[PDB]
Design a protein around this nucleic acid. Sequence first.
RNA 1: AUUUUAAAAUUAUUUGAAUUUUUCUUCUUAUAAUUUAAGUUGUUUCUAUACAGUACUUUCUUAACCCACUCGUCUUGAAACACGGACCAAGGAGUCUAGCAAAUGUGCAAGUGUAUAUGAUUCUUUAAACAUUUUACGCAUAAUUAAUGUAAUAUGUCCAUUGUAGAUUUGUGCCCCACUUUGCAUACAAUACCGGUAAGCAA
RNA 2: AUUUCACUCAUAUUAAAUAAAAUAACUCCAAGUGGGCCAUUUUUGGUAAGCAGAACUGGCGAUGAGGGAUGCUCCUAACGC
RNA 3: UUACCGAUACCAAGCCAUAAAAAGAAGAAAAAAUUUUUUUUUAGAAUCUUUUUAUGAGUAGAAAAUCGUGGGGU
Lengths: 186, 66, 155, 104, 51, 147, 125, 223
Amino acid sequence: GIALKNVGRIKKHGRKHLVSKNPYLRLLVKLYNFLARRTNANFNKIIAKRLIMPKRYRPPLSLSKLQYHMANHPNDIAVVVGSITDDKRLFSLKQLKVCALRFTETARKRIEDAGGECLTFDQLALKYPTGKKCVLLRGPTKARTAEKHFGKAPGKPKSKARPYVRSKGRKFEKARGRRKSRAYKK
Amino acid sequence: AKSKNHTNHNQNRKAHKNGIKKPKKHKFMSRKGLDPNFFRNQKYCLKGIQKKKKELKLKAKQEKNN
Amino acid sequence: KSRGKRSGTRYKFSKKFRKHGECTANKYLEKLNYGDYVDIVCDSTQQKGMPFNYYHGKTGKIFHITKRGVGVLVNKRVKHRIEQKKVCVRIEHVRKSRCNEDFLLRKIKNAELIKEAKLKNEHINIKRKTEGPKPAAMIKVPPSKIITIEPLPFY
Amino acid sequence: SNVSNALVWELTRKSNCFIKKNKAGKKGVFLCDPLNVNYKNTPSSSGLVKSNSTNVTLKDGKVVFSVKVNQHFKMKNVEKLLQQHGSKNKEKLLKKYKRLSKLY
Amino acid sequence: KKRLQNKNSLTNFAVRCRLNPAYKLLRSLAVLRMRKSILEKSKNKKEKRVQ
Amino acid sequence: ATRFKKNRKKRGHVSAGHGRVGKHRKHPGGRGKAGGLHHMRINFDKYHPGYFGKVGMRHLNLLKNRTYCPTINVDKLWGLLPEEKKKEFSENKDIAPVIDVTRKGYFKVLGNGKLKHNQPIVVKARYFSSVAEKKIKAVGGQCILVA
Amino acid sequence: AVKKVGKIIKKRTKKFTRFQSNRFMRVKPAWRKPRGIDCRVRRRYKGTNLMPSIGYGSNKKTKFLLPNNKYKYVVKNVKEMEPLIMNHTKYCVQIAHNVSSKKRKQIIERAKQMNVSVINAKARL
Amino acid sequence: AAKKIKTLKLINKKKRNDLRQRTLRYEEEYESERKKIIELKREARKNNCFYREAEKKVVFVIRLKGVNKLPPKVRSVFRLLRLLQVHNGVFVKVNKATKEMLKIVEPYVTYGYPTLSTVRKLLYKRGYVRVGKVRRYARKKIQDNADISKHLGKYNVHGIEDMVYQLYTCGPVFKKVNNFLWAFKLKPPRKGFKAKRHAFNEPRPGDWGNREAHINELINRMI
RNA sequence: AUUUUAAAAUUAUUUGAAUUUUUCUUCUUAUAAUUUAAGUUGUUUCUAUACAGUACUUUCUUAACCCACUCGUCUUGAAACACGGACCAAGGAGUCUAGCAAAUGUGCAAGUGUAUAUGAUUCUUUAAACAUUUUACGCAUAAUUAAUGUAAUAUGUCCAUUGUAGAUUUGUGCCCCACUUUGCAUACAAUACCGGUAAGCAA
RNA sequence: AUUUCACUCAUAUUAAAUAAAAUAACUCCAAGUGGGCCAUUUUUGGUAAGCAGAACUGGCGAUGAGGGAUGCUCCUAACGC
RNA sequence: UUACCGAUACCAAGCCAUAAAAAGAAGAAAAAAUUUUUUUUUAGAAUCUUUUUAUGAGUAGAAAAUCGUGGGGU
Ligand SMILES: O[C@H](c1cc(C(F)(F)F)nc2c(C(F)(F)F)cccc12)[C@@H]1CCCCN1
Ligand SMILES: [Mg+2]
Ligand SMILES: [Mg+2]
Ligand SMILES: [Mg+2]
Ligand SMILES: [Mg+2]
Ligand SMILES: [Mg+2]
Ligand SMILES: [Mg+2]
Ligand SMILES: [Mg+2]
Ligand SMILES: [Mg+2]
Ligand SMILES: [Mg+2]
Ligand SMILES: [Mg+2]
Ligand SMILES: [Mg+2]
Ligand SMILES: [Mg+2]
Ligand SMILES: [Mg+2]
Ligand SMILES: [Mg+2]
Ligand SMILES: [Mg+2]
Ligand SMILES: [Mg+2]
Ligand SMILES: [Mg+2]
Ligand SMILES: [Mg+2]
Ligand SMILES: [Mg+2]
């Protein structure tokens, strides 16, 4: 016998292969895997990882956010490993060059109007196999409604997690344990 | 029925499997309920600093513009 | 059955022999900052600001300072996990740590050494050389001083 | 622009109607493609995936020469055909043809 | 690289040599030492005794 | 579908995954919400803090309609116009778009977010938050109360 | 024990028969893995039936090779026969149990033309 | 490409040459040291004074007890050492902390001062090494110098001989070398142990003591 | 299908050295070969000049040496003097719906779901598929308060709050480095501001 | 005290060792479990108990193998073929 | 005091799985015959192939890969 941890075998806690059966997506992942293995430029590896990731970990990146990100360095190409959605809150859209997994139609249209460029991942690869002058961007992941229920459970002091409730209002989880006046608070 | 009402046996072992998890030790602990007055002063100072920085930035921008 | 604040504290809080009275007037002049490590040694002469039985002896960083109150971050092992506990104490129980200053002295010395090295461009080792193997030695001993030994008989 | 060889392969790596795999003796997956030189289930040999293939088949009785855009024809003659439309592989094809000839 | 045998160094002379290049010289020296006749050794004994 | 159900995967094990010593009995913890405040109080405390007790005023006949007032923030006001029209408006500082916020199905205008500077907006709505109104004015626009 | 023939190594020629399949008729020899406390087999006491385990498996390289060194391929029809024209030294034909005699004969004939071995040519002969 | 290859070859040759010289130097030193020791002893004998030989700097530690029925502290110590199997052997730089650790796991290990020849033998017949990116090691037998010249190239210790030398006497780079070496998976002794329960220092036949001068012998027996 | 190479070693040569004067003396200049490299190949039989035999393979069969206690079960513990089981065949047990959840897949995405229902050149399948009138409602986009209600920097600037670590980039001397350069996600705070509640003022 | 600048702190032996230390954190979703028992040592009640009750650790339980003739826990040692 | 016997522990070698790690989108080799025929192959399936190293107990439980039965579309 050997006094080891988990005996011999080295734990890896992450994705290994995309569970997805989307042929195009599979192809893309294959490509990026290849890129990673041949040119260890990191960037490629990261991209591959992102591609592999599940849908929650590819949150949608809003156009406004993208614009904000690009605000420092111009002409370089922002790459987003997820979907990009448009933002009615924006009035102006600069000349953006964006590579995404997905553009919502409206976002794409907006980009076009801006006199910009919409690149798919393959296109990006073709243009920049080492990912030169690229900038990886992610959407807000923990801004998801699921995440609001996680962490310390409501009941533990100073926790800011949303209880699973039916609706909202007085009649619904707003009494004992939520105000100094009904037993305790939080 | 009479039963083993208490034991701390194996507890230690259990604890040790995931290991005695040390505090994450964040650099910036929340200064909420900590010394008032002073903390408001600190906040004010910070604000002032920020303002100064902003002013500097503005000046720089102006210079750039010419 | 009985778990009060001062349970099993017959000796822990009891003042040492010929060291009763009260806390000395010079103990209050010990300067403390937001980051200093501190031992909590409960003087049960001052009942005000008395920390719990457990924290007697255990050290910790100062995170908060008030009029006469010192907040200390003390690590407590709770079954499966060690967690930080914010103990609000008084100055009478709070004593400044010594290890920190031992470290400080060493640091100071190291800086000096570094400076010296620079003066001359040299490779001087700073890391504390722990008690290693003893080097080869030739010890001069006269035959008059070498006292022979044999196991003692039973009585 | 929407369809490429790799994509095709991906689509039909599992779900073909030429793929026949031995249920008894698990090792072995064959492609019954009209444009497969060696009947292996690989995208680098399959007729569905490859843009240009010049396989020799048996079809119905008489030995038929197939070309990829799709052409059908009918040893010297075979060689000539190969020379004409063809871009080691040739040798293999020839060998296959010989074998086919043997069969009646 | 496909693993081949794992060759005993201490024996497989070539392998040993590869491992440690000076080893050959050492071996030669050893051989030379072995070579010398016993008469000389015997003679040396007297000298040793004297010393 | 049934074929990918865990029970099918546990089929040859004795207890069907529900434990050998502690069996699987019908309704162990009680039925439904059961001992909420008794044997299941801790769970309630930790996941459903303010569950027990009633707070505040009764409201015997609600009628949610009376109180219906869908909100929009100013930030999203200019978005309510098509891109080309928006561009045109931007170009022409001389003319200001009116927006019937009610016609677009909103009852209150709130003021979360910036509005493009100088560009005047005419906002028609039933309700406005002070701040939103202020924001509108700062930009040279007006709020025209509708009903 | 082990049954070397060519480079073909078989680790366990004996079938793993179900525990107690030899004791009650109702229990078939078909391996079933014993569960539940006090199994003896589960516990692996000296002297009982062995438990099939992954260690027993044949080298990835010679696995489904039969004594002939050819992977067995089942054949229902001439069309199927055809995938093995470029493989006569690596796959060997077996004609499906349900093939009528004429068809079987035809298949056999085809095989001979191809130089492909038939492992069951003698059915209905 | 050809030119590059040639250059590489030349470099390799140069390295080999350098290595040989180093080896020779080491050899010269070893004998010399021994001679000096003898001389010192003679001197001591001549004059009423005594000569104590320097503490042997390194200690070779072999496990005895199994994985089962062991205290947690002891287990931890073992882990730290890099002894995980019943006959795993490793070199440990004798220190204060190290000594303490050894003491803590005294009844479960046999240790002592390995001697040079024995060490060399160990390196040769039982010397396995870790080849790969950190935390993914792969136990590969040395055989070639280019296998160790990649990792230990920065620390001026190319070739097995250099490693051996380092092991023998705690040089500037010894710890790293030790780390690089995989835990020596040793045989059981060919003549067998006396008794694994009792100590080596026990008047009755035993093992787990600090067999400082007979450790080498033991190693030889179980090589 | 070029790390079964390169080197090591060895053999026969060739130039220069060395103190270990040595038919295994070492380095080294060059060339061929070989294996001690670079995980077993060769020779001679035999099966056998056989189509199955008494050989060879394998299934069964008893022997024999050694071992092996009735399975399931509840149990700290079952071979139990614990229970259930005479035997065999068939049947025989985490399912289905409602709502919620997280996980993941997919489409769309500040939207989304065409609900009922209509419409058709829809009518074996057609109880589906297609289509959606030439601001329906759900959930989400805003929260908060018992509540009348109130409702997120704030028009100096379409700009996008401030830190400390942080991916990617941009440069300098293609992964590490040591600086610059940008600062995703996120963690950790800090501020603003919105709803409530204090407190201070207060028409 | 915070912020921006300065000068400048060992570093390939890595601010004492040693470390199959990232197989780590963290988040989620769940399962089973919540009758335990035994051994050395410390130990309380009990005349004592294969008794009841505790402490540190290891086991058994969930575990076979070699030994202890025989044995859930003792010793050796944990098990692919 | 030796010698020996003696485990599923240890070592050396093989093979199996698991885990990880290297790494990967074009070409004739040999033998038998008698300079040309014949015999074999002449690979490139990304959860895939090649190689490397370590590891392998297990009830309650969890997961994955498979296997089979009744029917459906293909
Ligand atoms: O990666 C190449 C390759 C090319 C092309 C092609 F360009 F034709 F689409 N297709 C390949 C395919 C294909 F996509 F299935 F066709 C698979 C594997 C390799 C392919 C390989 C390279 C080695 C020789 C076989 N083609
Ligand atoms: Mg006491
Ligand atoms: Mg189970
Ligand atoms: Mg049951
Ligand atoms: Mg049991
Ligand atoms: Mg039983
Ligand atoms: Mg003995
Ligand atoms: Mg018996
Ligand atoms: Mg009982
Ligand atoms: Mg009963
Ligand atoms: Mg009965
Ligand atoms: Mg019955
Ligand atoms: Mg049945
Ligand atoms: Mg979902
Ligand atoms: Mg129970
Ligand atoms: Mg149990
Ligand atoms: Mg045991
Ligand atoms: Mg006995
Ligand atoms: Mg013991
Ligand atoms: Mg297992």
